[PDB]
Amino acid sequence: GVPPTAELIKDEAGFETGSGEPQEDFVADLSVDQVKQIAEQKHPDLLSYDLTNAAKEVVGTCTSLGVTIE
Amino acid sequence: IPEWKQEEVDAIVEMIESRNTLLERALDD
Amino acid sequence: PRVELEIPEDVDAEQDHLDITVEGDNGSVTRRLWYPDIDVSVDGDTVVIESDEDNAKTMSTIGTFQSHIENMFHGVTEGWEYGMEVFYSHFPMQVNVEGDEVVIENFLGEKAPRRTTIHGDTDVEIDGEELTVSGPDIEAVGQTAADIEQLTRINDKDVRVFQDGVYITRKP
RNA sequence: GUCUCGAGCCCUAGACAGCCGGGAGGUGAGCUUAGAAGCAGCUACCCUCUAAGAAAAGCGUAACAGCUUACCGGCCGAGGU
Ligand SMILES: [Mg+2]
Numbered sequence: 499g500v501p502p503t504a505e506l507i508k509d510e511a512g513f514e515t516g517s518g519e520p521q522e523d524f525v526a527d528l529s530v531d532q533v534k535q536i537a538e539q540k541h542p543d544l545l546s547y548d549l550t551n552a553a554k555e556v557v558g559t560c561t562s563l564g565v566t567i568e
Numbered sequence: 569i570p571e572w573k574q575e576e577v578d579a580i581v582e583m584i585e586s587r588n589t590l591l592e593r594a595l596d597d
Numbered sequence: 598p599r600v601e602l603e604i605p606e607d608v609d610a611e612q613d614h615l616d617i618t619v620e621g622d623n624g625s626v627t628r629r630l631w632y633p634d635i636d637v638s639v640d641g642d643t644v645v646i647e648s649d650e651d652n653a654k655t656m657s658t659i660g661t662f663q664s665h666i667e668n669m670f671h672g673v674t675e676g677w678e679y680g681m682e683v684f685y686s687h688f689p690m691q692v693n694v695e696g697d698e699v700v701i702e703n704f705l706g707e708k709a710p711r712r713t714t715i716h717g718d719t720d721v722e723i724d725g726e727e728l729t730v731s732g733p734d735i736e737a738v739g740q741t742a743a744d745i746e747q748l749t750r751i752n753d754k755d756v757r758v759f760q761d762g763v764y765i766t767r768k769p
Numbered sequence: 770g771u772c773u774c775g776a777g778c779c780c781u782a783g784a785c786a787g788c789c790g791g792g793a794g795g796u797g798a799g800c801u802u803a804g805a806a807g808c809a810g811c812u813a814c815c816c817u818c819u820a821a822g823a824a825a826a827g828c829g830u831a832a833c834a835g836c837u838u839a840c841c842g843g844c845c846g847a848g849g850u
Binding site: 502503504515516517518519520521522523540543544545546547551552554555556557558559560561562563564 | 793794795796797798799800801811812813814815816817818819824
């Protein structure tokens with residue numbers, strides 16, 4: 499039921515299109531608290547037991563786009 | 569004796585306290 | 598080298614000279630297993646294939662003799678069976694078992710019937726568009742099935758377009 | 770084709786082959802695009818579950834789907850490469 503991960507990032511980022519080269523061309527940005535919220539949403543989608551690992555999963559598409567974290 | 573096999577036997581013996589051959593190995597311990 | 602084959606309880610295996618006869622509930626099969634310095638004997642309840650020579654050539658045949666004997670065991674008990682399907686596009690092919698040979702009529706529209714003789718005590722059972730070749734001797738069954746498929750061999754035209762024929766569908 | 774001799778690596782903590790089962794999630798990665806979801810192209814190629822399982826090696830689809838490869842487990846059992 500819950501929409502794809504790539505989209506949930508583009509909302510709180512303010513950017514739509516990614517980059518011609520991931521990590522080499524930083525586009526969007528995030529923060530720890532921002533990622534903590536997206537981790538609360540997906541439960542059946544993710545296989546992780548802890549919320550710690552739930553964040554790790556979300557933070558897999560991020561950096562490979564240009565989503566730097568602070 | 570490959571290192572990954574010795575290191576695996578350990579991880580198995582660890583979960584017992586708290587490949588079928590590696591399980592039997594951990595049991596014998 | 599020496600390899601011992603324990604004969605199944607359903608089976609009986611007598612042997613004279615270079616010939617080996619294997620009898621079972623499904624029938625009997627006799628074969629000649631002749632090769633330099635390879636002795637094949639029946640020691641009570643086991644068949645023994647042995648030789649003093651261990652060279653590549655000898656070992657090759659020893660392995661062949663083993664598989665041959667094991668197949669006879671299977672044949673006289675469980676039996677050998679090949680399944681076939683008759684396919685045709687424009688011309689309805691009339692496959693029939695006339696006497697001791699399978700006959701194919703009107704193949705690809707031909708006026709003259711194509712036929713092949715069935716090997717040994719091999720039985721060919723036909724059920725509409727399906728055929729089932731069976732028997733105790735895998736040698737006879739294997740060939741009989743093959744013969745049937747080969748019977749519709751076509752060399753003059755593009756097989757990709759002219760696909761009519763009986764084909765081996767299931768192998769044991 | 771076959772005979773002989775040497776060297777390296779693997780192997781009963783189960784090798785080589787074969788057969789069976791698994792080959793999973795975030796997600797059909799992002800860019801490109803009407804679309805492209807392992808596999809037209811460009812960049813990247815990151816982390817969960819776990820005993821394994823690639824941001825996919827090979828076919829396959831208009832794209833999907835579909836079939837196997839990697840990798841893991843089992844059966845087998847002795848040498849193998
Ligand atoms: Mg021509």
